[PDB]
Design a protein around this motif. Sequence first.
Motif, PDB file in Angstrom:
ATOM      1  N   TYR A   1      -4.390  10.208  -0.161  1.00  0.00           N
ATOM      2  CA  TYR A   1      -3.930   9.091   0.652  1.00  0.00           C
ATOM      3  C   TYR A   1      -3.393   9.599   1.984  1.00  0.00           C
ATOM      4  N   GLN A   2      -3.677   8.846   3.049  1.00  0.00           N
ATOM      5  CA  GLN A   2      -3.210   9.169   4.395  1.00  0.00           C
ATOM      6  C   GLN A   2      -2.553   7.916   4.982  1.00  0.00           C
ATOM      7  N   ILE A   3      -1.355   7.607   4.486  1.00  0.00           N
ATOM      8  CA  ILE A   3      -0.644   6.417   4.936  1.00  0.00           C
ATOM      9  C   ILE A   3      -0.291   6.564   6.406  1.00  0.00           C
TER      10      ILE A   3
ATOM     11  N   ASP B   1      -3.785   4.856  -8.519  1.00  0.00           N
ATOM     12  CA  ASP B   1      -5.194   4.617  -8.241  1.00  0.00           C
ATOM     13  C   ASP B   1      -5.459   3.123  -8.380  1.00  0.00           C
TER      14      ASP B   1
ATOM     15  N   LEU C   1      -4.594  11.978  -5.503  1.00  0.00           N
ATOM     16  CA  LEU C   1      -5.331  11.106  -4.594  1.00  0.00           C
ATOM     17  C   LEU C   1      -5.011  11.448  -3.140  1.00  0.00           C
TER      18      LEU C   1
ATOM     19  N   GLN D   1      -6.858   4.721   5.151  1.00  0.00           N
ATOM     20  CA  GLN D   1      -5.704   5.390   4.564  1.00  0.00           C
ATOM     21  C   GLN D   1      -6.005   6.015   3.207  1.00  0.00           C
ATOM     22  N   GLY D   2      -7.266   6.031   2.783  1.00  0.00           N
ATOM     23  CA  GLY D   2      -7.654   6.693   1.555  1.00  0.00           C
ATOM     24  C   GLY D   2      -7.874   5.783   0.367  1.00  0.00           C
ATOM     25  N   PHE D   3      -7.771   4.469   0.545  1.00  0.00           N
ATOM     26  CA  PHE D   3      -8.065   3.514  -0.522  1.00  0.00           C
ATOM     27  C   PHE D   3      -9.554   3.198  -0.453  1.00  0.00           C
TER      28      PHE D   3
ATOM     29  N   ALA E   1       0.806   4.190  -2.833  1.00  0.00           N
ATOM     30  CA  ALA E   1       0.506   5.575  -2.487  1.00  0.00           C
ATOM     31  C   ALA E   1       1.658   6.509  -2.831  1.00  0.00           C
TER      32      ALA E   1
ATOM     33  N   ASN F   1       1.317   7.577  -6.322  1.00  0.00           N
ATOM     34  CA  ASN F   1       0.011   8.132  -6.675  1.00  0.00           C
ATOM     35  C   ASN F   1      -0.755   7.188  -7.598  1.00  0.00           C
TER      36      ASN F   1
ATOM     37  N   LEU G   1       0.822  -1.206   0.000  1.00  0.00           N
ATOM     38  CA  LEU G   1       0.000   0.000   0.000  1.00  0.00           C
ATOM     39  C   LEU G   1       0.859   1.260   0.000  1.00  0.00           C
ATOM     40  N   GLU G   2       1.938   1.271   0.788  1.00  0.00           N
ATOM     41  CA  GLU G   2       2.810   2.440   0.813  1.00  0.00           C
ATOM     42  C   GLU G   2       3.468   2.665  -0.544  1.00  0.00           C
TER      43      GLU G   2
END
Length: 394
Positions: free
Chosen positions: A372-374, A289, A370, A326-328, A284, A287, A280-281
Amino acid sequence: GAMAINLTSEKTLKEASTSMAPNVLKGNVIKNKAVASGKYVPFFGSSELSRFSAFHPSVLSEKYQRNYRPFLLGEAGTQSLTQAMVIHSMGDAIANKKAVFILSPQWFVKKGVPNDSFGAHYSQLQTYQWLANLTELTSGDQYLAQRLTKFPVVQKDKVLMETLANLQAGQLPQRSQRDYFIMNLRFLNREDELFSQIGMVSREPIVEKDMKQLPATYNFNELDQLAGKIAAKAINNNKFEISNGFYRQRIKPVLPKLAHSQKKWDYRFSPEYGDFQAALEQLAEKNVDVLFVIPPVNKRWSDYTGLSQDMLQQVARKLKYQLQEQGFTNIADFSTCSNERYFMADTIHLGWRGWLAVDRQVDEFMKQPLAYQIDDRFYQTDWQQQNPLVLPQF
Ligand SMILES: [Cl-]
Ligand SMILES: [Cl-]
Ligand SMILES: [Cl-]
Ligand code: NA
């Protein structure tokens, strides 16, 4: 090699997109060029990707001449840690593009990805490239270092082990360590150019055969009904709606021993949640999607093995929390479709109506126009061991 061998030719990328060739998965030239072109959407997954039929996304995309094609990346034994390095090795090729990530609940076993599964797909090219180009250290880099030192395929590489020790201590690779990787990369990149196509067997012949089963124009409801008719032919030698070949080869000889064999299986606690965070990191940071897919387990089979569908819903809740938190937000959760007939090809692999449903979500996702908030704390053992009964339903 002869100059006429063009690894980046249009035909080569098309042939490799459905091959699931492990040498392509471990390489860079072919897969990176395909994703960088913007025409091939990487499908990160495992053995379910090979369950081809008229309704597999690779066949539907070719039949109806879409502006994209899947590029299947994975096979049996390729879990999140392997895929995180596959993603990282794409670099700017995947930046700002779209991808599909097919989760398997079976990945999230108590001890995580087996040693031999990671070792069978370990890419020295991608691992050395990652360390050679490392200029700023992130928590993700330190988590990757920690995990890699746990596998025998890495432990026998002393310079690598020494480099990973410094990463965990918060230090970049030493000059002599980076130089070492650069020396080897000269060989590894040459071997990628020379050998990455050995063993590649494209499924394009299967695509063109199954295309003859599909109507000239796309209609979901028509296809959904057709998938039931075709599936009904291919699951008639057993009562579990499992493909005939899969059943007579893997289930029939040991059918009595499999009863209740999975009552105690549990996917709620696993290092794979941390390895999944690593993927995921990487997504993200570039960027990317991403549409995430969660498959079900056939109800008729879980009733026989005792695998808890309630537990599978706890797993889905945990995964969807880690994603949504986390924004996904692009998630096709089909884990509640366990009782949908003809959805699976066998016990755990998506099949006729399952791929059709996934294909619709992928196609709609590709047409979407996007933040994202990892949170690095998803790497921690307390999340790997977190009981998901406390989590909200996102
Ligand atoms: Cl379409
Ligand atoms: Cl079969
Ligand atoms: Cl149950
Ligand atoms: Na799988």
